[PDB]
Design an enzyme around this catalytic site. Sequence first.
Site, mmCIF file in Angstrom:
data_model
loop_
_atom_site.group_PDB
_atom_site.id
_atom_site.type_symbol
_atom_site.label_atom_id
_atom_site.label_comp_id
_atom_site.label_asym_id
_atom_site.label_seq_id
_atom_site.Cartn_x
_atom_site.Cartn_y
_atom_site.Cartn_z
ATOM 1 C CB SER A 245 -18.745 -9.926 20.591
ATOM 2 O OG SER A 245 -17.459 -9.341 20.765
HETATM 3 C C1 LIG Z 1 -13.246 -12.994 24.157
HETATM 4 C C2 LIG Z 1 -13.838 -12.686 22.801
HETATM 5 C C3 LIG Z 1 -13.514 -13.764 21.814
HETATM 6 S S1 LIG Z 1 -13.311 -11.083 22.208
HETATM 7 C C4 LIG Z 1 -14.823 -10.542 21.519
HETATM 8 C C5 LIG Z 1 -15.384 -9.216 22.063
HETATM 9 C C6 LIG Z 1 -16.870 -9.331 22.020
HETATM 10 O O1 LIG Z 1 -17.547 -9.447 23.051
HETATM 11 N N1 LIG Z 1 -15.108 -8.829 23.420
HETATM 12 C C7 LIG Z 1 -13.964 -8.018 23.741
HETATM 13 O O2 LIG Z 1 -13.193 -7.666 22.847
HETATM 14 C C8 LIG Z 1 -13.718 -7.574 25.179
HETATM 15 N N2 LIG Z 1 -13.554 -6.139 25.086
HETATM 16 C C9 LIG Z 1 -14.046 -5.205 26.080
HETATM 17 O O3 LIG Z 1 -14.601 -5.601 27.104
HETATM 18 N N3 LIG Z 1 -13.872 -3.785 25.853
HETATM 19 C C10 LIG Z 1 -14.288 -2.709 26.752
HETATM 20 C C11 LIG Z 1 -13.853 -1.432 26.080
HETATM 21 N N4 LIG Z 1 -13.546 -1.799 24.739
HETATM 22 C C12 LIG Z 1 -13.272 -3.204 24.704
HETATM 23 O O4 LIG Z 1 -12.660 -3.791 23.822
HETATM 24 C C13 LIG Z 1 -12.647 -8.330 25.959
HETATM 25 C C14 LIG Z 1 -12.902 -9.611 26.307
HETATM 26 C C15 LIG Z 1 -11.879 -10.397 27.085
HETATM 27 C C16 LIG Z 1 -10.674 -9.799 27.449
HETATM 28 C C17 LIG Z 1 -10.406 -8.393 27.069
HETATM 29 C C18 LIG Z 1 -11.330 -7.670 26.360
HETATM 30 N N5 LIG Z 1 -15.736 -11.623 21.741
HETATM 31 C C19 LIG Z 1 -15.370 -12.388 22.908
HETATM 32 C C20 LIG Z 1 -16.299 -13.583 22.968
HETATM 33 O O5 LIG Z 1 -16.825 -13.984 21.882
HETATM 34 O O6 LIG Z 1 -16.558 -14.174 24.070
#
Ligand SMILES: CC1(C)S[C@H]([C@@H](C=O)NC(=O)[C@H](NC(=O)N2CCNC2=O)c2ccccc2)N[C@H]1C(=O)O
Length: 515
Positions: A245
């Site tokens: 993100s």
């Molecule tokens: C926890 C959040 C709010 S989600 C969002 C986002 C951005 O980093 N990160 C994710 O959507 C992350 N996805 C991820 O790692 N992957 C790998 C393959 N595709 C996929 O979705 C995730 C984070 C925690 C639990 C489950 C999934 N931003 C996080 C922030 O700001 O800390």
Amino acid sequence: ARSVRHIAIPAHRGLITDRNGEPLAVSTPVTTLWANPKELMTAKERWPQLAAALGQDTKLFADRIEQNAEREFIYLVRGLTPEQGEGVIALKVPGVYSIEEFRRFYPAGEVVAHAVGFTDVDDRGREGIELAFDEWLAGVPGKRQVLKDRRGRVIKDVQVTKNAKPGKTLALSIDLRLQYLAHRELRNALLENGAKAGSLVIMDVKTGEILAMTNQPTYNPNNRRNLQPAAMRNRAMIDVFEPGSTVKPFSMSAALASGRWKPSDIVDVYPGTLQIGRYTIRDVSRNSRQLDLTGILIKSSNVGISKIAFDIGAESIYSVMQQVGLGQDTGLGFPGERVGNLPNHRKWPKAETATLAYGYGLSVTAIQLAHAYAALANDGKSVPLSMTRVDRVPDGVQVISPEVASTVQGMLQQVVEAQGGVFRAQVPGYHAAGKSGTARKVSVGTKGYRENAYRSLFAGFAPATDPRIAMVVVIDEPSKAGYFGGLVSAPVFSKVMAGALRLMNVPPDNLPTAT
Ligand SMILES: CC1(C)S[C@H]([C@@H](C=O)NC(=O)[C@H](NC(=O)N2CCNC2=O)c2ccccc2)N[C@H]1C(=O)O
Ligand SMILES: [Cl-]
């Protein structure tokens, strides 16, 4: 057996300092004692006194000399202090000589080990800056002739045939004060969180200088006795990761530059998922049905960013990312440094378009991410990275329009300061801006992702009114107090940015919360 011998004259290796003259690697004068066994064999009743002064066991010392009675040269001890060698020579034991040598010393030790690196037993650069600038730093040893008689006793220094040439001084971009602060705070957060590794990079957004670069685990370059390979890694430079993100501000920059989007636009993100073929895009935060552009970044909606991405297309996103230096050679030439990977495709399916926009399927280094945020902070002007003190401000390349950069700066300020935002990243006395990220770590022995192992990220810059400093905090496998980037890495950003801005005498722009 009466002839002339050529002995080396040790050259002084170049001083490595930080940006203000603080010594980081210094060649210190030491004294090595050597003996002519043939001469010592005639002064045997001086042995016990000499052994004691060398901190050695009388008999073991005697065994040494006797086993070498045939030889004309043996080391007694290497690397004593000048005064220690002074004391032993003053005893006037026949057949004991001294030679002045240098020992490379690292005054800040573990605090800057990864950046500075070290020299080997032949003081040739082997890691880090010591390796990368070895030619600059290395001296040229000299040579001189000595006359020895049949028994090998030195009777005359004949002549110097070649003077030693000292190496040159090198000033790094690093501010040791910031390096100390960053090192301590990263270590603390690693320990509080039970994490496995971490990196922290601080950058001058105007000059491209790396002000601080620290990693955990680290090591003491002055004592590498039990050193393990893993602790040697300058992870900020040489390890890559999916930024997640933290690339969303750049996807947003592409959206705004496309002519097809404006900050007031609202995106429908219900039900917090988006099905495309077999793959499913998922939001973690699922407490809103729709979000404007700013709220997509505040809530970190993958679905929101995906919908924008489908509209603008992958090429516009790929382009901003390439332009801010993600997956691109930094031109630093730090040993082992990785370029990372920004995938280029013939055609972009929806899946790859979406994941690119929310930061998976590409790999970057912490230095690259920080450089990218510096570009945004510096009103869209990207300046080359430097690990050496810069005299005059380099010419920048306008990689994002000032207008787009200005809007995205505002959105990122909101991500930190607005209700529901990343409040742990707030910096006392200042307006800060930034973006958190949380990524699943890649599986070890297969494709895909680990279920319960994460990388926590925060990237940002401050002050918001006139950005001076960008910073990236990356923490691997936190396991004791949560794992979200806004929980784990944001507090590090807050404390280090606060100390950094103060140390650099940047005036507070948020006195309602000052110190
Ligand atoms: C926890 C959040 C709010 S989600 C969002 C986002 C951005 O980093 N990160 C994710 O959507 C992350 N996805 C991820 O790692 N992957 C790998 C393959 N595709 C996929 O979705 C995730 C984070 C925690 C639990 C489950 C999934 N931003 C996080 C922030 O700001 O800390
Ligand atoms: Cl796991």
